[PDB]
Write a protein that binds this ligand. Structure first.
Ligand SMILES: Nc1nc2c(ncn2[C@@H]2O[C@H](COP(=O)(O)OP(=O)(O)OP(=O)(O)O)[C@@H](O)[C@H]2O)c(=O)[nH]1
Ligand SMILES: Nc1nc2c(ncn2[C@@H]2O[C@H](COP(=O)(O)OP(=O)(O)OP(=O)(O)O)[C@@H](O)[C@H]2O)c(=O)[nH]1
Ligand SMILES: [Mg+2]
Ligand SMILES: [Mg+2]
Lengths: 431, 184, 1107
């Protein structure tokens, strides 16, 4: 029985975590009251991985929500599923970090970081054997950007033998017009490289473009992006909550998908693409899903998987497809002589097959690969980070709190070295 | 909680204050409140409740809660003595027939446990009138020397004319800011 | 400063009545309103001037009886957002408080549904509004189910709501039951209702705990905002009911916090508010234990209760409380107990309760709290007990007086400044600085209280690195904060767990020793000489660093009076510097994880000792240091990669300092016995199969001084060049070749220039051989399993070609030849146009540094005027070469020159056809901008095509430049660049291009190379004549390949070309070709595809192929 502690910080982080928990609860068959009412025995053989069995046969979540601002806290407390989260697992202040990374990591977010450690430690004491912590936040802001880094740096010192996985949400100028976002993203990535084993990047520009073109929505709001983020999160954590032949734990998955220490950013995806409201319209097959998992349109990041090498590939199928039918399809797409052969679907790919399908869909698929194209996500922020650094714009706010140009240049050098290593590995011999 | 947050929270309470204003009927307390904030006097009506007013002055934020003077409301003044730093009491000098109707209530407001600590300030209004008693006579008719557990300072002022309206609040603020600590 | 979004706010609300039906518009407005309001979360006092009208535009909507429920909910959402931003306490004073606003509000709240989770913002705010209407000085009976009963029922039904509305029910009942007419009517009823809920509910369910929390909050608010004499009779029953529940044992933090908050309030009701039932004896018993809780929120709440209770009780009990709280600092407690005790002491001192009798005790504990850091694992704990000590010290300014604090000021002021500088947490430093400022402003009896604040203000204790080399010296300048400040650093930080604390402390001591040399040489150095024998690993590193730093500082100080270094340090201390190496060599401490740290420390120690000119020359200590350096430069692969560069750059520096200090016989010469062996061993170590051995030995041999290279320079140069040469065995040896060039560059920079001396320095006799080795490593393009590692070998190959070219320019510029200079310039230009970003930036920087160098100007600069005009001085620091957008537009202009055309184009082809997307997108746009200017001139286009064909011919059968070039040709042809060559039949250029393409597509197997070939073959159909027909034939050969994907791609490309160019096929036969290329499965068996291929050939006039 391997348990996982889920933590949420920042407005966007909490909004994503609430939706993800609601999705994985509706898929497992858990009414919003707390009891169980599903119709499948497979929805309980691994429920202990994210739910504590309290008295009375109830399943208490393990989501530790923290937020300096008392906004999203009250909304999640009175949500469709707000009554599930323990009430002393909510840790908040009054004034946030004011879009400054040096506020939610040094002067403000380090004022509740001690209450966070007490809560995450009180939650882990009941577990029989902890596997690894988890965090869901956005690189944009101060309580998501600085608080997450502070907690990741503080927990690694007391639990070095635990896996550290995050779900960073890179912002984009299209979604937010804030100008102090490049610095918060750079400083967050600087800490998310030396104290993180895995990081699932969910760029906001990709979801914005998807909602603008694919879904054809009028004004894509935050709900449309949160729905896709929660869908991708539920599709990624399919092996850690359901049985199957590929019993890849968290540590095993991180070791098999992350050969290098610094390189650990993935490009998660999910298909088919849907929206809120209606969903039932067309039933997809295994060939169509495989053809669409590997399309740059189904990806949640502004990167072209085809343009770049393939470090490690993995896919998770959900529905009445059999690992034998999947192997037949995964052994004819890595062959040129084979018809309908693809050049971007690589070899030695990891593949899974689930029984319980997602909500509102009979068949789906999730992609969790790591391509060098992700470098584009790091360069877009580099340029915006240099043009504003030469003029020293909005730097007094950082220098007054305690930060200095030393950390800025260190983060810049780290990002440059990472981009250089990515570009160097992109040109490697296949055999 | 750290020391910085404690200091930031204490500064908010030190800068913000609350002043409970009371007085018998037609004592001229709302005619003095409007003048302190700069408003019209020819549009005041007998208030039958309580009025809250927030205004900045010398950096401080004066939260003045003024209550009427009708007897029917005198039995509901127990809902204003919380977090009260100053207690203003208006007295009509020309009402020398009800100076014992305001002395009987003044001897019951200082003994309160909640008001035990706030600075008292007596405002003798209606001084420009012909039969208006001076501050010395009011200090003796109300028996102000008997008070000892409160820092009182009877002062003669006016509303329609406006005389010594600023010093009255200045002295109260100076006396409230002199305390290093307070009860809770 | 002020609110500036109000101009947009009044318009938003104006649209509230229109976006009430739509969902997208409502969400956009709500999100917009929230992003407009969250900007002033730090400045809540800036929205007060606008709290008047902003409210009138909201409550006025719900007041209208002719509005739907959606609009009411949307308005309540904005109201709740405004309350969250500003605050309910300061915002409900604006809500209507008339007797005619009560029955309206009540019916409004009663029209709600607690099950509706979407409208939770309407139920949470409405209740609050009711509280306002409960402030009227009127009786509920005058308004007239009664109103009091309805309010009580609503409160009882909401006090068990799992949503936020429960909180709204706390402030409501707190004002309704505490009324004159309702504290004699509903108070007893709500009291029997709370006792039943507390006795029945349990903390094992989610609903039982919710009701318990609600009841506890309601009781705590009632006892807080309620009369003391009214809630006194019912003070024992509630206490007994709370004690019978066993809250401390429950596993709930909020429940325990509320229980403590209720217990402290109940205790405050027994005592009279002045400037003691047996029940009180229990209240205290429930508060002290609260300080020894696991959570900090419980201790923070218990501290306030204890502070409030000690002030309403006598002076005998007040002293007993302090005596009992002092017991928490015993030798059998954790850090949480100390934190709680410090919080309680601060809360007690803030009110002025501690007597001078407890000065000898309290002061005897705070000194231990400011420096609390008890290692509790990999990291240490105590940052909580330290932040509390700051607040405790801040309270002494208001409690004790100067006369009562003078005996302990000498120790308090020093401790404050010690904890306000070298602290690891910025919060602790800021708290200590604030406490010091408060003590100086009130007491004013601190030594130099004003001078210490001006230099260490709130905006000065921010940068930790600055506090260790700026504020430390300023504080040590006075004789009151020198010896204790040094002792603290010696006995705390230099023995810390983190390594940044053992490096910063050493650097701070380096400067502190300048103001107190006697104390650091006679009292501190002996303590650092004995600390090295400590079994602790973090203690030995710190002691070594301190011994090195203090030694360097003493040497620098003695250098002023041209006095020897032995004046400050005695010979006893000198013998320690010799035995430190023997002690480490005997115990064999150079193993395990700490071996690398010990080696790094000893390297810095030896470097600082050799840089001070110690009396160690001619002793076995020098031999031991040399052996240790050799062993460290001998075993490098065993060290982790996260700290290999540091050990590589420190060992070489230490060896150079030793070889440039001790290893000398006379001025201008050295001991031949050591010169005949060191160089020999190094040359026998530069041929070591292990790549890490050479990587460490090359730099060590190159870092030698100039007097130690006299006569043996040719041998060293030959040995270094032998490593730079590639061989079948050394294929993936890039790090070794990099160090080989780095050492050569270092030797060249050290020896300088001297004519008539090839064995002593560089001259015209060996400059050609040196330049040949530097120009040969630039062509290294190895592609190992890791990737393009050869780039590394090029990096050091660029700087080596820069610093060298300048060296001659500063002595004998005539040695630089014209051909070599032109080759170096062309190679740098090629290297400054590579798809890579980090390497291209360095290449452009080197190019600019070499071009702008005019002191003196460097000879043999091709097109020097054009290069200066295309790359002015202002475009050096402002242009970001790392960004392709801010690099390619300026690099593509070099194609105009003749010399910068072949190499520049070869370098840009890699970026115009690589794998990255943004780089290609930028390079194509930059190339099109230049081609647009040379599109009409036929000579320029012909020269460009000739250069491209020459580059193609040069890199033939090469998968590094062939694929990028073929990919770039596709875009060049699709854009329409070679439009002038299409008006002539049988163009030699298009013929040779097709011939080379046929060569490159000969037996092509990989699909990546086949795609570019197919694209080029389909983009070449534009050229009429024999190139049109022959090219078409190739397409046919690709329509029946060995894979169906190739056939499908070829068919798609042919269909696209048929639609692009219409003059290629006649209109009479175009219909048949279009119909045959549509209803034909090109991914089927070849038996059926051959018929379609023959049919298409018969129509396109292409001769029937033959197997
Ligand atoms: N996808 C998505 N992005 C969001 C959401 N909320 C905010 N963001 C983005 O995240 C950034 C803002 O960070 P927040 O999470 O709002 O901030 P915070 O972490 O609470 O920090 P403070 O502003 O300091 O209080 C911007 O780039 C927003 O576009 C959300 O619900 N979904
Ligand atoms: N002549 C004169 N009349 C004054 C003066 N100050 C106030 N008044 C009048 O005294 C009367 C009572 O003052 P108000 O403020 O209106 O009433 P109140 O004192 O607030 O009492 P409540 O109505 O019980 O709340 C009004 O007619 C005022 O205009 C003054 O200095 N001179
Ligand atoms: Mg926020
Ligand atoms: Mg009035």
């Amino acid at each position: 029985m391997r348990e996982i502690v889920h933590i949420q910080a920042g407005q966007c982080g909490n909004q994503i975590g609430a939706k993800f928990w609601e999705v994985i609860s509706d898929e497992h068959g858990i009414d919003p009251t707390g009891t169980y009412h599903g119709d499948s025995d497979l929805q309980l053989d691994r429920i202990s991985v994210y739910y504590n069995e309290a008295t009375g046969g109830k399943y208490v979540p393990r989501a530790i929500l923290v937020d300096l601002e008392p906004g999203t806290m009250d909304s999640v407390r009175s949500g469709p599923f707000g009554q599930i989260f323990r009430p002393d697992n909510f840790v908040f202040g009054q004034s946030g970090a004011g879009n400054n990374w040096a506020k939610g990591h040094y002067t403000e977010g380090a004022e509740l970081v001690d209450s966070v450690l007490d809560v995450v430690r009180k939650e882990a004491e009941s577990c029989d054997c902890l596997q690894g912590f988890q965090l869901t936040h956005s690189l944009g802001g101060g309580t998501g950007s600085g608080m997450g880094t502070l907690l990741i740096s503080k927990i690694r010192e007391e639990y070095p033998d635990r896996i550290m996985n995050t779900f960073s949400v890179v912002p984009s100028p299209k979604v937010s017009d804030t100008v102090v976002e490049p610095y918060n993203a750079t400083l967050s990535v600087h800490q998310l490289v030396e104290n993180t084993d895995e990081t699932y990047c969910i760029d906001n520009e990709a979801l914005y473009d998807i909602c603008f073109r694919t879904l054809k929505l009028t004004t894509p709001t935050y709900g449309d992006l949160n729905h896709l983020v929660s869908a991708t999160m539920s599709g990624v954590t399919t092996c850690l909550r359901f049985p199957g032949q590929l019993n890849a734990d968290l540590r095993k998955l991180a070791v098999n998908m992350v050969p290098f220490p610094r390189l650990h950013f993935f490009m998660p995806g999910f298909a088919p693409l849907t929206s809120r409201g209606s969903q039932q319209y067309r039933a997809l097959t295994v060939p169509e899903l495989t053809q669409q998992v590997f399309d740059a349109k189904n990806m949640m990041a502004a990167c072209d998987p085809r343009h770049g090498r393939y470090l490690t590939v993995a896919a998770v199928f959900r529905g009445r497809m059999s690992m034998k039918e999947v192997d037949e399809q995964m052994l004819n797409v890595q062959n040129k002589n084979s018809s309908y052969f693809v050049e971007w679907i690589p070899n030695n790919v990891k593949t899974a097959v689930c029984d319980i399908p997602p909500r509102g869909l009979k068949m789906a698929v999730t992609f969790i690969g790591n391509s060098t194209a992700i470098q584009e996500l790091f360069k877009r922020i580099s340029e915006q980070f240099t043009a504003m650094f030469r003029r020293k714009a909005f730097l007094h706010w950082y220098t007054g709190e305690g930060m200095d140009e030393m950390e800025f240049t260190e983060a810049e050098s780290n990002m440059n070295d990472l981009v250089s290593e990515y570009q160097q590995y992109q040109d490697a011999t296949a055999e | 909680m750290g020391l910085l947050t404690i200091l930031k929270k204490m500064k908010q309470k030190e800068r913000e204050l609350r002043l409970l204003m009371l007085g018998l009927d037609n004592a001229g307390k709302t005619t003095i409140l409007k003048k302190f904030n700069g408003e019209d006097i020819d549009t005041i009506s007998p208030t039958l409740g309580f009025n809250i007013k927030t205004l900045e002055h010398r950096g401080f934020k004066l939260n003045i809660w003024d209550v009427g003077g009708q007897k029917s409301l005198r039995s509901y003044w127990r809902n204003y003595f919380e977090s009260t730093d100053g207690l203003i009491w208006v007295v009509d000098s020309a009402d020398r027939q009800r100076m014992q109707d305001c002395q009987r209530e003044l001897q019951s407001l200082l003994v309160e446990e909640r008001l035990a600590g706030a600075t008292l300030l007596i405002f003798a209004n209606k001084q420009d009138l012909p039969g208006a008693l001076s501050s010395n006579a009011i200090r003796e008719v109300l028996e102000l020397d008997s008070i000892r557990s409160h820092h009182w300072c009877i002062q003669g002022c006016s509303a329609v004319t406006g005389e010594n309206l600023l010093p009255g609040i200045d002295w109260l603020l100076d006396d409230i800011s002199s305390r290093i600590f307070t009860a809770d | 400063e002020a609110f500036g979004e109000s101009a947009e706010t009044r318009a938003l609300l104006g649209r509230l009545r229109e976006v009430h039906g739509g969902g997208a518009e409502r969400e956009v407005a709500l999100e917009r309103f929230r992003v407009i309001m969250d900007k002033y979360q730090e400045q809540p006092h800036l929205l007060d001037p606008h709290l008047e009208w902003m409210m009138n535009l909201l409550l006025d909507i719900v007041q209208d009886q002719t509005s739907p429920a959606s609009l009411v909910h949307l308005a309540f959402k904005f109201l709740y957002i405004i309350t969250k931003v500003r605050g309910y306490k300061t915002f409900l004073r604006l809500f209507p408080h008339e007797v005619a606003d009560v029955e309206p509000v009540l019916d409004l709240v009663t029209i709600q549904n607690p099950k509706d989770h979407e409208a939770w913002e309407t139920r949470y705010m409405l209740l609050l509004w009711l509280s306002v209407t409960c402030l009227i000085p009127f009786d509920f009976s005058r308004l007239d189910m009664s109103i009091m009963d309805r309010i009580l029922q609503i409160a009882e039904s909401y006090l068990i709501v799992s949503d936020k509305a429960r909180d709204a029910a706390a402030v409501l009942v707190s004002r309704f039951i505490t009324r004159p007419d309702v504290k004699q009517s509903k108070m007893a009823e709500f009291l029997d209702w709370s006792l039943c809920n507390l006795a029945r509910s349990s903390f094992q369910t989610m609903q039982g705990v919710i009701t318990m929390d609600g009841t506890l909050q309601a009781l705590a608010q009632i006892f807080k905002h309620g009369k003391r004499e009214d809630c006194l009779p019912y003070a024992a029953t509630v206490l007994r009911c709370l004690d019978g529940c066993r809250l401390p044992e429950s596993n709930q933090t909020l429940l325990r916090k509320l229980g403590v908050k209720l217990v402290q309030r109940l205790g405050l009701t027994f005592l009279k508010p002045k400037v003691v039932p047996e029940g009180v004896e229990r209240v205290i018993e429930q508060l002290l234990v609260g300080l020894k809780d696991k959570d900090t929120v419980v201790r923070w709440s218990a501290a306030k209760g204890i502070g409030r209770m000690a002030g309403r009780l006598p002076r005998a009990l007040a002293d007993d409380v302090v005596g009992s709280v002092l017991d928490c600092f015993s030798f059998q407690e954790t850090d949480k107990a100390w934190h709680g005790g410090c919080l309680a002491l601060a809360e007690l001192g803030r009110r002025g309760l501690l007597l001078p009798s407890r000065l000898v005790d309290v002061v005897a504990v705070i000194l231990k709290a400011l420096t609390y850091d008890e290692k509790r694992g990999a990291c240490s704990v105590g940052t909580n007990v330290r932040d509390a000590a700051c607040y405790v010290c801040w309270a002494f300014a208001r409690a004790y007086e100067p006369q009562e604090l003078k005996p302990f000021v000498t120790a308090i002021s020093s401790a404050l400044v010690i904890a306000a500088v070298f602290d690891r947490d910025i919060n602790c430093r800021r708290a200590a600085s604030a406490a010091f400022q408060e003590n100086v402003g009130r007491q004013g009896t601190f030594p130099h209280g004003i001078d210490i604040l001006t230099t260490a203000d709130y905006f000065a204790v921010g940068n930790r690195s600055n506090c260790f080399l700026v504020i430390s010296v300023f504080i040590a300048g006075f004789p009151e904060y020198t010896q204790p400040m040094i002792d603290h650093l010696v006995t705390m930080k230099i023995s810390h767990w983190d390594g940044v604390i053992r490096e910063l402390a050493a650097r701070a001591l380096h400067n502190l020793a300048q103001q107190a040399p006697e104390f650091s040489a006679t009292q501190v150095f002996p303590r650092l000489l004995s600390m090295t024998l400590s079994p602790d690993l973090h203690m030995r590193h710190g002691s070594i660093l301190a011994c090195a730093e203090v030694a360097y500082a003493l040497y620098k100080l003695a250098a002023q009076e041209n006095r020897p270094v032995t004046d400050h340090l005695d010979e006893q201390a000198v013998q320690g510097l010799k035995q430190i190496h023997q002690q480490l060599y005997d115990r064999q401490l150079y193993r395990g994880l700490g071996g690398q740290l010990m080696r790094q420390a000893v390297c810095v120690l030896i470097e600082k000792l050799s840089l001070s000119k110690m009396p160690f020359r001619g002793d076995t200590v020098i031999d031991g240091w040399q052996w240790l350096i050799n062993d460290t430069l001998r075993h490098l692969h065993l060290i982790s990669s996260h700290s290999r560069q540091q050990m590589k750059d420190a060992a070489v520096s230490a060896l150079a300092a030793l070889c440039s200090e001790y290893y000398m016989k006379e001025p201008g010469e050295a001991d031949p016995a050591i010169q005949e062996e060191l160089i020999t061993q190094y040359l026998a170590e530069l041929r070591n199969p292990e790549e890490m051995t050479r990587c460490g030995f090359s730099l060590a041999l190159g870092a030698l001084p100039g007097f130690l290279l006299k006569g043996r320079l040719q041998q060293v140069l030959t040995g270094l060049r032998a490593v730079t040469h590639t061989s079948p065995e050394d294929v993936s040896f890039a790090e070794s070749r990099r160090d080989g060039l780095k050492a050569i560059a270092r030797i060249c920079q050290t020896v300088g220039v001297k004519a008539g001396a090839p064995d002593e320095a560089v001259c015209g006799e060996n400059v050609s051989q040196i330049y040949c080795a530097l120009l040969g490593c630039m062509d290294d393009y190895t592609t190992d399993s890791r990737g393009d590692v050869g780039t590394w070998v090029r990096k050091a190959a660029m700087t080596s070609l820069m610093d060298l070219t300048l060296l001659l320019a500063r002595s004998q510029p005539e040695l630089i030849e014209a051909h070599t200079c032109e080759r170096i310039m062309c190679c740098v230009a090629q290297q400054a146009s590579e798809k890579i970003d980090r390497f291209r930036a360095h290449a452009a920087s080197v190019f600019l540094t070499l071009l702008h160098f005019d002191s003196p100007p460097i000879p043999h600069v091709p097109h020097r005027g054009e290069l200066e005009k295309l790359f002015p001085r202002s475009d050096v620091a402002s242009v970001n070469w790392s960004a392709p957008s801010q690099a390619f537009p300026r690099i593509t202009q070099l194609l105009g020159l003749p010399t910068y055309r072949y190499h520049v184009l070869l370098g840009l082809v890699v970026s115009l056809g690589g794998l990255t997307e943004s780089t290609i997108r930028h390079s194509t746009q930059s190339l099109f901008e230049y081609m647009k200017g040379i599109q009409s001139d036929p000579q320029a286009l012909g020269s460009f095509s000739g250069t491209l064909l020459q580059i193609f011919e040069d890199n033939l059968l090469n998968e590094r430049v062939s694929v990028p070039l073929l990919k770039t040709l596709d875009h060049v042809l699709t854009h329409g660049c070679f439009d002038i060559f299409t008006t002539e039949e049988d163009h030699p250029f298009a013929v040779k291009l097709l011939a080379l393409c046929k060569k490159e597509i000969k037996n092509s197997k990989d699909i990546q190379k086949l795609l570019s070939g197919i694209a080029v073959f389909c983009e070449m159909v534009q050229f009429p004549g024999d190139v049109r027909r022959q090219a078409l034939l190739q397409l046919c050969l690709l329509l029946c390949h060995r894979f169906p994907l190739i056939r499908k791609t070829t068919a798609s490309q042919v269909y696209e070309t048929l639609l692009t160019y219409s003059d290629v096929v006649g209109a009479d036969v175009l219909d048949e070709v279009v119909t045959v290329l549509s209803d034909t499965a090109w991914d089927a068996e070849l038996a059926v595809v051959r018929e379609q291929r023959n049919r298409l050939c018969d129509l396109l006039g292409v001769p029937r192929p033959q197997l």
